[PDB]
């Protein structure tokens, strides 16, 4: 018996859901006064485990109506003869005991798309759902609610009109969203006053709502075992976070305080990727909005990817971590196609930073020669000349780029339609050497007698990654100073 | 620096739906099906 | 039930389709003493949301005939050939009642062309439909209508004399046809004085009719959104303007196919190519009989090559706005597929849509991945990069001249392209796009200053005089740099 | 007709073919016009299921039985 | 090759066998660099994916005699890009080369493609063709 | 004959093959001439199927299994 | 190595997932004179393929999970 | 065993699954040993068809309503 | 020998049935320089003819004795 | 089973030229069966041991004793390699004038060791494709473990210095799939059955 106060984060979407499934059911005469019919189908999507099945049961028990349920991978695994009668029994029983809701989940297993890999059944069940849903609108108190994992694998005939027209995007919560579900899942565990809530929510930063019930039970089981309460940090080191090996990794929590110096890059990254994503009211009357492309070049170990995850956690957006040789090139045609779906994924989860490394190869793709590959590294730049400036005013994406060789820049990639804002990342000077190194030994319980001004005087042409070896060698011998302290 | 691409093809099924051997139906007739509550079925005697 | 007045916008196709259903049933005596037999099949085809099943139900209830329905994915069996027995079951049931009408929607789903399957039961499913329609010797009893979305995926044996002739394309209601759709849907809703249906069809490009019914419903959601909860809601002009931006048109399949909302004067300078663009498809559409009088075919293709960023996306999409033709958008290596056998058929369906959506505008970008003048790099594979260029060089020659087919180019490398690509008769005018001079780089900045309120105290040519050999996109970088340099204090 | 045969259940298309040739010769002269024979007999590399082999071997056997003039 | 199975030379098998059955029938052959370019070379095809194109073009030559009226014409822009077994003796013993039109032929080209035109005969079409030396009939 | 065995199903075809070898045993000497073994026994490894090892495995245990001189 | 084209970068990251699942494991890279010699010297067609195979392990040295004792 | 119970029918494997959990309730404590989970629930990257997702949906269903004792 | 796969070795199988069931036989192959493109050329000091048809040729052409008249 | 067809076909030829007790089977009927035999087992390496003496070849007596002091002593008792902590030999080499009778020298090594012999051809490292150059050379190795004791013969070992850097997109297992496995398969023995 769940209610409205059991989940949060999507409260802006939970309010617009309550006017979609409760308002036509509790007040069906309001649509009679306006003339039009009430909507029938609203679907939800996102990552599975944000509470997609718990959301439908919460609004069902908070309304007192009938709750019909048809499972996705259960009724479609029959021999194509009982599925069309189960859907006929589903709409007939909901009409008998109106008001009623109909919740279905995993509709992608019922309704896939038509592709080149034909051979499945793919029919006789979704077409039964087409002829069942377009009727029944004779002011009947029935609604259908769909749920799926991938919102783009669904057949486009469902999301046309009158069958599934309204959509909601329940995704991962923010830092305050995981803070709300942490107070919900810890209402019965008798914790002490040593636990935190804001710091425990901020140290997660990528945790789906299903993990909060598992991370609470793992820390509670550890407290039981010590009988024959800061065990939450033990649970993060043992349990693996959900969305394990996807492109949504967040395990490094370096903010803008932990990275020092380079003030000609911090304010010059605030000008391009935080201004249209926060204040777009001035960008619609001062030309085109987005400043997507930005280039970073310089010496090796100058701090290129140190600021990659730092800007990705400031606005708490997604971070597409695509490596350099990610064009896998198993054949001849898929090498230009595997770069396009990750751009469409950036448009779905917009705004989202995308990272690349040294993919400029049209200067070596000269015309009419003999030494060339079989279709890669000469025609994938022709896809790069048409998929980078595929912009939209409702997405305002931005793409960063870090390289170490500014001499091989293509003459067509240094263009305002491509990555144009090139910024040299220089060496850290004597003032930036203190701002980088002091933020890295903040976790070290060091003595304040040793000042790093002598390190900056002993390092004149050293890079910041070479300075990171100095604090690593100082910490590795402080470990040896701690090893020869407990044995005697 | 080259590729190998090949597709596939399938055939789904055919069926006949043949069943009901005659020896199962002859055993299917000679049985009982149950009688409500008080629907006795009787005996009878005669021809001394 | 719906009727003849339930749908507008297709009044030309309504009076055309009403002849082949009323005359074989109401007055069959016109086919007597003339020798011929009345036809049976009517073929409708178009995009989804145009009202194919709505027009089928409207003609059934307005005549009182024995209507029947045959669904596409429903009657398709794998048990013992039961689809071949259920098609002839529906034909004898329609023959028992006179007059009757059957309807087969999504006919491409039932036994399509054999370019892919070629061995399944669908080869023997369509041949059942050949002998069923040809054996309809019962005159003036059954009239069959069909509906689909792609006329090229069906087998061409249906387009014949006996079974399915007299095909009609249900087009897009652009010539004030959306006003008739708005008159049907909004006649039941309560309206105000500020609304006007004539100020809605001029801004809704496309809008086949299904999204128009979604637009008035979403405008009612905005009206009831302000009610916190005897009731007088109405509508307003701002509700339809809210439904324009907060709801997508029919573009979930492809992102941009219509336009990018530009005009003639959005390209900076280049007034000479604006004159030469008036010899393109704007010219010979309204007078095509002059080339038949002069006895020669018009120009087929104009090619362009030069420095990148000088107007190969603005002028390439300005043709889609100066005539508002059936534009398509296709990228260079997006035409390239992963399969080897698809390497020649992918250009075929694109060119087949061009002759079917006449008048149309097509274009190409980055032909260096498509031309490949050496003709495949090394070989040795099961498939090679040689059929992608040798197919379009012959298919573009096998097109009708009076069908509004042409090509236009946008490249950056003049050496990867083949000499037969730049051949006259296929791509005639070798026009190198030039770098703009000091007389044309003043209107380059003015292409962006038309929409933003620039202060008149700032000199317009002072920023333009800093260019000493720059491109047309470089002055967009200045106003993009000024887009983040103008505010600076309003956070 | 071609597609009208093989659409039966439980294997009676052979009995509809055996009664076709038997009833023709009982009232000779007769003409057996098999229309659309390409929908009955494909090649052996494009075989489909098991009932397609059963009707092409029934036709090849029964064609040889007409040698009695 | 639109279908990946069977319909590669089976769409040509009803062209070869029907040319002697439905005689007279003239079959034109073009686009020679898109059928047998890499398959007939020294490197060939390795894997048996689509090597089924250069076989039926050669084995249908010796099996066809001059019993009925058959006629084939091969035309291409690159004559050396085709397999040399297509130019085997006994089938291509007559090689006719179409040359470039000279100055005595380019003036009559301009009188040929200007057929249905209201052309004024007072002008000189030779003066246009006299400035065409490396300019072919497309120019 | 060849195709007359494949015109039946799997059940009655094995019973008809068993009846032919029993009557020839009591009528020794006898000649059991079978025809068209390619339709019954094709190349099995190209089409690894179910019926391609049904009637030939019944024949192989009956051909190698018989011993009565 | 890269026999065909790009057939080495998929065979580098295919061992990183099982290196941390069955932990503790180590991985022993040996004889780097075929990859770590070409940065800006070889400018041929093999040098263009050399620039595509050395950035796989260069990004995987700092992109690997360093808390799984690999 | 994994491939043993799932090799039966859909209604037959469900009846053996349902009768095992109601038997385990009346003799608490009980241990229900399941082997070879990979044969019942493989990965969904290229394993097409839907015959495996029927039985694994009933395992997650019956693992819920056993909260109290 | 330039037919589809599977039939490229069955033609040489018929001349081996002609060595046994239809003896005698005479084998003859003409234009040995055109078949070198299909057989392949050995280069350097370590090479060989990696061909599909030469494995079935060279093994059974030496196993037959003089009585089969090969 | 081929012997059972040899005695029946030779006896059937004897019946053919008698009628045209008066029966008699000569050796020439079996000589007719020799020219009409059916070789079935051809695509398998020879597993049978031979009995050719070392005196069939002439000279090179200084290298027959060096091979007799290495491999034919531990196959009877391997205690000589364990009393001082040593390992048996993995691979030998021969080099000089090519094709001067090294196949019969590879035949005669399986007689003083009282074991079998496996004859793997020379250019089979390049004639075998991808997979065939790796799986087939180890499908005989575990078969040699079941047929222990035995010896394996290889030839044309000059491919290690020319087919190491395999990065071309034309060849398959003939360029790079040999060098990646001979360093592993030669040291991938069990040291208990003495292949
Ligand atoms: N607001 C919330 N956000 C995220 N998780 C929640 C929230 N409230 C509760 N949870 C926990 O998350 C779980 C919800 O997962 P759920 O049952 O939706 O699985 P699912 O995989 O999303 O469903 P489906 O099988 O339909 O995909 C519950 O078991 C609950 O303990
Ligand atoms: N502001 C900074 N200046 C210099 N070094 C930094 C700074 N911030 C972090 N670093 C150190 O430098 C390293 C960054 O390496 P990264 O690979 O991201 O860039 P890089 O060294 O330039 O590499 P590449 O040359 O391949 O781009 C980190 O490991 C970090 O310890
Ligand atoms: N006169 C009209 N012209 C176009 N659209 C209309 C008209 N009247 C109503 N509509 C709207 O268009 C939709 C009609 O689409 P319809 O149901 O025919 O889908 P369809 O895809 O054409 O059918 P099918 O599945 O048979 O192809 C209705 O939902 C309706 O709101
Ligand atoms: N008349 C004009 N002349 C030059 N530039 C213009 C003009 N009008 C607009 N621009 C700016 O120049 C850019 C046009 O660049 P475009 O999209 O053509 O890139 P491109 O590299 O030329 O295209 P392609 O990738 O096909 O080579 C636009 O972003 C626009 O802001």
3-state secondary structure chain J: CHHHHHHHHHHHHHHHCCCCCCCCCCHHHHHHHHCCCCCCCCCCCCCCCCCCCHHHCCCCHHHHHHHHCCCCCCCCCCHHHHCCCCCCCCCCCCCCCCCCCHHHHHHCHHHHCCCCCEECCCCHHHHCCCCCCCCHHHHCHHHHHHCCCCCEECCCCCCCCCCCCCCCCCCCCCCCCCHHHHHHHCCCCCCCCCC
Q: If we measure between CA atoms, which residue out of C46, C45, C39 comes closest to residue C19? A: C39
Q: What is the DSSP letter of I3?
A: S
Q: If we measure between CA atoms, which residue out of J103, J97, J188 comes closest to residue J137? A: J188
Residues of C with Cβ-Cβ distance to D36 under 8 angstroms = 127, 130-131
Q: C30 is written with which tokens?
A: 């016109």
Q: How many residues does chain E have?
A: 139
By alpha-carbon position, which residue is closest to atom 8 of ligand 2?
A303
- Residue C58 and residue A195: Cα distance in Å, rounded? 69
Sole residue written with tokens 């008769």:
C425
On the 0-12 / 13-18 / 19+ scale of CB atoms within 10 A, C114 is middle
Q: What is the DSSP letter of I46?
A: S
- Residue C280 and residue C300: Cα distance in Å, rounded? 9
Half-sphere exposure of A286 (CA within 13 A, CB side): 21
**Bridge partners (DSSP) listed for residue C44:** C147, C168
Q: How far is the CA of E120 from the centre of ligand 3 (A)?
A: 57
- Residue C73 and residue C251: Cα distance in Å, rounded? 25
Q: If we measure between CA atoms, which residue out of A259, A263, A283 comes closest to residue A273? A: A283
**DSSP string across A455-483:** HHHH-SS--HHHHHHHHHHHHHHHHHHHH
Classify strands C41-45 and C66-67 as parallel, antiparallel or unpaired: unpaired
On the 0-12 / 13-18 / 19+ scale of CB atoms within 10 A, A23 is middle
Go through C323-341 and write b for each residue having 16 or more CB atoms within 10 A of its CB, e for each that does not: eebbbbbbbbbbbbbbbbb
- Residue A70 and residue C128: Cα distance in Å, rounded? 37
Chains J and D are touching, with contact defined as 3 or more CB–CB pairs separated by less than 8 Å: no
Helices C442-449 + C474-481 axis angle, to 10: 40
- Residue D36 and residue C118: Cα distance in Å, rounded? 17
**DSSP string across C262-283:** --GGGS-S-HHHHHHGGGSTTS
Q: If we measure between CA atoms, which residue out of D27, D5, D14 comes closest to residue D61? A: D14
Q: If we measure between CA atoms, which residue out of A20, A278, A304 comes closest to residue A146? A: A20
Is ligand 4 within 6 A of the CB of residue C478? no
**Bridge partners (DSSP) listed for residue C105:** C147
**Bridge partners (DSSP) listed for residue C431:** C304
CA distance J43 to chain C (A): 29
**Cα dihedral H14, H15, H17, H18 sign:** positive
With beta carbons less than 8 A apart as the criterion, state whether J170 and C380 touch. yes
Residues of B with Cβ-Cβ distance to D50 under 8 angstroms = 14
User: Distance of CA J155 to CAs A211, G52, J188, Å?
Assistant: 62, 37, 20
**CB atoms I63 and J39 under 8 Å:** yes
By alpha-carbon position, which residue is closest to atom 27 of ligand 4?
C308
Neighbouring chains to C with at least 3 Cβ pairs closer than 8 Å: A, B, D, E, J
Q: Which residue from B minimizes the CA distance to E6? A: B9
CA distance I6 to chain J (A): 17
**CB atoms G1 and J168 under 8 Å:** no
Classify strands E70-74 and C407-408 as parallel, antiparallel or unpaired: unpaired
Taking CB atoms and a 6 Å cutoff, what residues make up the pocket around ligand 2? A 259-262, 300-306, 402, 404, 428, 436, 463-465, 468; G 62
Q: How far is the CA of C50 from the centre of ligand 3 (A)?
A: 5
Is ligand 4 within 6 A of the CB of residue C476? yes
- Residue C307 and residue C371: Cα distance in Å, rounded? 19
**Cα dihedral I33, I35, I39, I40 sign:** positive
**For the CA of C409, the nearest ligand:** 4
By alpha-carbon position, which residue is closest to atom 28 of ligand 4?
C473
**Cα dihedral H6, H8, H11, H17 sign:** negative
CA distance C279 to chain E (A): 19
**Bridge partners (DSSP) listed for residue A144:** A41, A102
**For the CA of A210, the nearest ligand:** 1
How many CB atoms are located within 10 Å of the residue I67 CB?
Answer: 14
**How many angstroms from the chain centroid is the CA of residue C168?**
16
- Residue E22 and residue E17: Cα distance in Å, rounded? 9
**CB atoms I65 and J34 under 8 Å:** yes
With beta carbons less than 8 A apart as the criterion, state whether A429 and A303 touch. no
Classify strands C301-305 and C429-432 as parallel, antiparallel or unpaired: parallel
The helix/strand/coil state of E92 is: coil
Q: I65 is written with which tokens?
A: 């004795």
Classify strands A398-402 and A352-356 as parallel, antiparallel or unpaired: parallel
Number of H helices, E strands in chain G: 2, 0
**Bridge partners (DSSP) listed for residue A399:** A293, A354
With beta carbons less than 8 A apart as the criterion, state whether A151 and A345 touch. no
**CB atoms B2 and A330 under 8 Å:** no
Q: What is the DSSP letter of A204?
A: T
User: What was the experiment behind these coordinates?
Assistant: cryo-EM
Is the peptide bond between C359 and the residue preceding it cis, with omega within 30 degrees of 0? yes
Neighbouring chains to B with at least 3 Cβ pairs closer than 8 Å: A, C, D, E, G
By alpha-carbon position, which residue is closest to atom 24 of ligand 3?
C53
J21 shares contact with chain C (CB less than 8 Å) = no
Is ligand 3 within 6 A of the CB of residue C2? no
**For the CA of A465, the nearest ligand:** 2
Q: What are phi and psi of A168, to 5 degrees?
A: -130, 145
**For the CA of A182, the nearest ligand:** 1
Q: If we measure between CA atoms, which residue out of A49, A76, A147 comes closest to residue A105? A: A147
- Residue A320 and residue A349: Cα distance in Å, rounded? 10
Sole residue written with tokens 């100095």:
A470
Mutational pocket test of ligand 3: of A35, A36, A37, A161, the residue with most ligand atoms within 8 Å of the beta carbon? A161
Helices A126-133 + A83-96 axis angle, to 10: 20
Q: How far is the CA of C250 from the centre of ligand 3 (A)?
A: 14
- Listed by the residue before each break, gaps in chain F with C–N over 2.5 Å are none
Q: If we measure between CA atoms, which residue out of J166, J182, J143 comes closest to residue J47? A: J143
How many CB atoms are located within 10 Å of the residue J151 CB?
Answer: 18
> Three-class SS string for chain F?
CCHHHHCCCHHHHHHHHHHHHHHHHHCCCCCCCCCCHHHHCCCCCCCCCCHHHCHHHHHHHHHCCCCCC
- Residue A189 and residue A172: Cα distance in Å, rounded? 25
A327 shares contact with chain B (CB less than 8 Å) = no
Q: If we measure between CA atoms, which residue out of A213, A217, A216, A219 comes closest to residue A231? A: A219
Is ligand 4 within 6 A of the CB of residue A64? no
Go through F9-39 and write b for each residue having 16 or more CB atoms within 10 A of its CB, e for each that does not: beeebbeebeeeeeeeeeeeeeeeeeeeeeb
With beta carbons less than 8 A apart as the criterion, state whether G2 and G46 touch. no
User: ∠A418-A422-A424 over CA atoms, to 5°?
Assistant: 160
**Bridge partners (DSSP) listed for residue E28:** E73
Mutational pocket test of ligand 2: of A297, A465, A467, the residue with most ligand atoms within 8 Å of the beta carbon? A465
**DSSP string across C214-226:** HHHHHHHHHHTTS
Annotated binding site of A for ATP: 48-54, 149, 185, 301-306
Contacts of G61 (CB under 8 A, 6+ apart): none
Q: Which residue from I minimizes the CA distance to J32? A: I67
Q: Helices (DSSP H) in E20-131: which residue ranges?
A: 56-62, 103-110, 126-129
Neighbouring chains to H with at least 3 Cβ pairs closer than 8 Å: A
- Residue C212 and residue C197: Cα distance in Å, rounded? 12
CATH number at residue B45: 3.10.20.90
Number of structural domains chain B divides into: 1
With beta carbons less than 8 A apart as the criterion, state whether C63 and C70 touch. no
Chains H and B are touching, with contact defined as 3 or more CB–CB pairs separated by less than 8 Å: no
Is ligand 4 within 6 A of the CB of residue C444? yes
Q: Helices (DSSP H) in chain E: which residue ranges?
A: 10-19, 56-62, 103-110, 126-129
Q: Which residue from G minimizes the CA distance to J130? A: G3
On the 0-12 / 13-18 / 19+ scale of CB atoms within 10 A, A479 is exposed
J168 shares contact with chain C (CB less than 8 Å) = no
The helix/strand/coil state of C360 is: strand
User: ∠C135-C45-C139 over CA atoms, to 5°?
Assistant: 25
- Residue J73 and residue J96: Cα distance in Å, rounded? 28
- Residue I1 and residue A18: Cα distance in Å, rounded? 74
Q: C420 is written with which tokens?
A: 């037969």
Considering only CB atoms, C253 lies closest to which of A35, A156, A331, namely A156
**DSSP string across A373-425:** -SSTTTSHHHHHHHHSS---TTT--EEEEE-S-SSS--TTTSSTTSS-EEEE-
Q: A277 is written with which tokens?
A: 């994503």
Q: If we measure between CA atoms, which residue out of J160, D55, C419, C308 comes closest to residue A388? A: C308
**How many angstroms from the chain centroid is the CA of residue D66?**
14
Q: Which residue from B minimizes the CA distance to D11? A: B16
Residues of G with Cβ-Cβ distance to B2 under 8 angstroms = 4-5
Q: Which helix (H) or strand (E) holds C326?
A: strand C326-327
Number of H helices, E strands in chain B: 1, 0
Mutate to test the interface with E, among C296, C380, C393 (most CBs of E within 10 A): C380
Q: Which residue from C minimizes the CA distance to B13? A: C78
Q: Which residue from B minimizes the CA distance to A335? A: B3
With beta carbons less than 8 A apart as the criterion, state whether J117 and J110 touch. yes
**Bridge partners (DSSP) listed for residue J153:** J119
**For the CA of C47, the nearest ligand:** 3
The helix/strand/coil state of C168 is: strand
Mutate to test the interface with F, among D61, D63, D64 (most CBs of F within 10 A): D61
User: Distance of CA A393 to CAs A284, C486, H10, Å?
Assistant: 9, 20, 51
Four-CA torsion C124, C126, C127, C133, nearest 10 degrees: 150
On the 0-12 / 13-18 / 19+ scale of CB atoms within 10 A, J145 is middle
Q: How many residues does chain J have?
A: 195
On the 0-12 / 13-18 / 19+ scale of CB atoms within 10 A, E77 is middle
**Bridge partners (DSSP) listed for residue A66:** A100
User: ∠C83-C89-C90 over CA atoms, to 5°?
Assistant: 95
Q: What is the DSSP letter of A252?
A: -
Q: E96 is written with which tokens?
A: 């006719």
Contacts of H24 (CB under 8 A, 6+ apart): H30, H32
Domain, as residue range, for B46? 1-48
**CB atoms B4 and E4 under 8 Å:** no
Q: Strand (E) positions, C33-137? A: 41-45, 66-67, 100-105
Q: Which helix (H) or strand (E) holds C429?
A: strand C429-432
**How many angstroms from the chain centroid is the CA of residue E69?**
19
- Residue C232 and residue A34: Cα distance in Å, rounded? 9
């Amino acid at each position: 018996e769940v209610g409205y106060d059991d989940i949060g984060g999507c409260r802006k979407q939970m309010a617009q859901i309550r006017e979609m499934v409760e308002l036509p059911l509790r007040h069906p005469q309001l649509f009679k006064a306006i003339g039009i019919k009430p909507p029938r189908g609203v679907l939800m999507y996102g990552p599975p485990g944000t509470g997609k099945t718990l959301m439908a049961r919460a609004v069902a028990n908070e309304t007192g109506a009938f709750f019909f349920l048809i499972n996705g991978p259960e009724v479609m695994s029959k021999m194509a003869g009982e599925s069309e009668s189960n859907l006929r029994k589903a709409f007939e029983e909901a009409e008998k005991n109106a008001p009623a809701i109909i919740f279905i989940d995993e509709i992608d297993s019922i309704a896939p798309k038509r592709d080149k890999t034909n051979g499945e059944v793919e029919r006789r069940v979704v077409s039964q759902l087409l002829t069942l849903m377009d009727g029944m609108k004779a002011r009947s108190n029935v609604v259908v609610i769909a749920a799926t994992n991938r919102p783009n694998s669904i057949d486009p005939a469902l999301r046309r009109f009158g069958r599934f027209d309204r959509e909601v995007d329940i995704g991962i919560p923010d830092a305050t969203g995981r803070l709300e579900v942490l107070r919900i899942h810890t209402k019965n565990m008798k914790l002490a006053d040593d636990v935190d809530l804001e710091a425990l929510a901020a140290e997660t930063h990528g945790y789906v709502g299903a993990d909060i019930a598992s991370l609470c039970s793992e820390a509670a089981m550890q407290q039981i075992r010590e009988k024959m309460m800061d065990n939450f940090r033990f649970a993060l080191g043992n349990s693996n976070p959900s969305a394990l090996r996807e492109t949504v990794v967040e395990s490094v929590n370096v903010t803008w305080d932990d990275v020092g110096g380079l003030d000609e890059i911090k304010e010059e990254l605030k000008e391009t990727v935080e201004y249209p994503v926060l204040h777009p009211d001035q960008y619609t009357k001062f030309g085109l909005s987005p400043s997507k492309g930005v280039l970073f070049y310089g010496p090796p170990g100058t701090g290129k990817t140190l600021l990659a995850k730092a800007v990705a956690t400031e606005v708490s957006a997604n971070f597409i971590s695509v490596k350099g040789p990610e064009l896998l090139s198993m054949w001849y045609g898929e090498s230009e196609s595997n770069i396009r779906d990750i751009f469409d994924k950036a448009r779905a989860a917009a705004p989202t930073v995308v990272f690349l490394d040294q993919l400029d190869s049209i200067a070596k793709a000269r015309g009419g020669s003999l030494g060339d590959a079989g279709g890669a590294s000469d025609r994938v730049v022709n896809q790069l000349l048409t998929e980078m400036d595929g912009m939209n005013a409702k997405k305002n994406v931005f793409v960063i780029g870090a390289t170490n060789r500014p001499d091989q820049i293509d003459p067509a990639i240094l263009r305002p339609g491509r990555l144009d804002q090139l910024i040299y990342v220089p060496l850290p000077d004597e003032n930036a050497r203190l701002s980088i190194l002091n933020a890295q030994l903040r976790k070290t319980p060091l003595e304040p007698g040793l000042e790093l001004t002598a390190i900056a005087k002993a390092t004149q042409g050293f890079s910041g990654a070479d300075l990171l070896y100095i604090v690593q060698r100082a910490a590795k011998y402080a470990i040896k100073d701690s090893i020869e302290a407990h044995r005697q | 620096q080259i590729f190998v691409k090949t597709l596939t093809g399938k055939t789904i099924t055919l069926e006949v739906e043949s069943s009901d051997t005659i020896d199962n139906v002859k055993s299917k007739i000679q049985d009982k099906e149950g009688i409500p509550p008080d629907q006795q079925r009787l005996i009878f005697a005669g021809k001394q | 039930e719906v009727g003849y007045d339930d749908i507008g916008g297709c009044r030309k196709q309504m009076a055309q389709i009403r002849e082949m259903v009323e005359l074989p049933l109401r007055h069959p005596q016109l086919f007597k003493a003339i020798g011929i037999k009345p036809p049976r099949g009517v073929l409708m085809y178009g995009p989804p949301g145009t009202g194919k099943t709505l027009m089928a139900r409207a003609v059934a209830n307005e005549t009182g005939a024995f209507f029947f329905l045959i669904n596409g994915p429903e009657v398709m069996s794998k048990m013992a050939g039961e689809s071949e027995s259920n098609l002839r079951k529906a034909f004898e049931e329609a023959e028992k009642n006179a007059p009757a009408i059957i309807f087969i929607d999504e006919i491409d789903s039932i036994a399509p062309k054999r370019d892919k399957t070629n061995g399944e039961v669908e080869r023997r499913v369509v041949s059942q439909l050949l002998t069923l329609m040809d054996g309809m010797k019962a005159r003036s009893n059954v009239v069959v209508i069909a509906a689909t979305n792609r006329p090229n995926s069906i087998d061409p044996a249906l387009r014949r004399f006996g079974r399915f002739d007299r095909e009609v394309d249900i087009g897009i209601p652009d010539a004030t046809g959306r006003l008739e759709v708005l008159r049907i849907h909004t006649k039941n809703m309560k309206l105000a004085d500020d609304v006007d249906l004539e100020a809605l069809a001029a801004e809704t490009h496309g809008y086949v009719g299904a999204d128009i019914a979604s637009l008035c419903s979403e405008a009612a959601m905005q009206q009831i959104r302000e009610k916190m909860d005897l009731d007088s809601l109405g509508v307003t002009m701002d509700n339809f303007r809210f439904a324009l931006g907060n709801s997508n048109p029919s573009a979930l399949r492809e992102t941009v196919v219509e336009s990018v909302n530009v005009t003639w004067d959005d390209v900076g300078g280049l007034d000479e190519i604006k004159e030469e663009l008036k010899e393109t498809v704007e010219y010979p559409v309204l007078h095509p009989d002059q080339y038949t009088k002069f006895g020669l075919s018009p120009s087929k293709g104009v090619l362009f090559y030069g420095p990148p960023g000088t107007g190969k996306t603005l002028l390439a999409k300005a043709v889609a706005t100066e005539v508002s033709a059936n534009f398509i958008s296709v990228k260079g290596p997006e035409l390239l597929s992963m399969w080897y056998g698809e390497s020649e058929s992918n250009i075929r369906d694109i060119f087949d849509k061009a002759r079917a959506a006449a008048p149309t505008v097509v274009f190409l970008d980055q032909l260096d991945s498509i031309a490949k003048a050496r003709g495949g790099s090394l070989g040795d594979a099961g498939g090679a990069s040689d059929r992608v260029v040798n197919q379009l060089l012959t298919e573009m020659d096998g097109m009708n001249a009076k069908k509004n087919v042409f090509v236009i180019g946008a490249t950056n490398r003049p050496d990867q392209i083949d000499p037969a690509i730049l051949r006259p008769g296929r791509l005639d005018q070798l026009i190198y796009v030039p770098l703009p001079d000091e007389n044309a780089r003043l209107s380059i900045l003015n292409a962006q200053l038309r929409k933003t309120p620039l202060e008149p105290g700032l000199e317009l040519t002072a920023i333009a005089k800093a260019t000493q050999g720059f491109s047309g996109a470089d002055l967009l970088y200045i106003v993009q740099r000024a887009a983040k340099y103008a505010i600076k204090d309003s956070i």
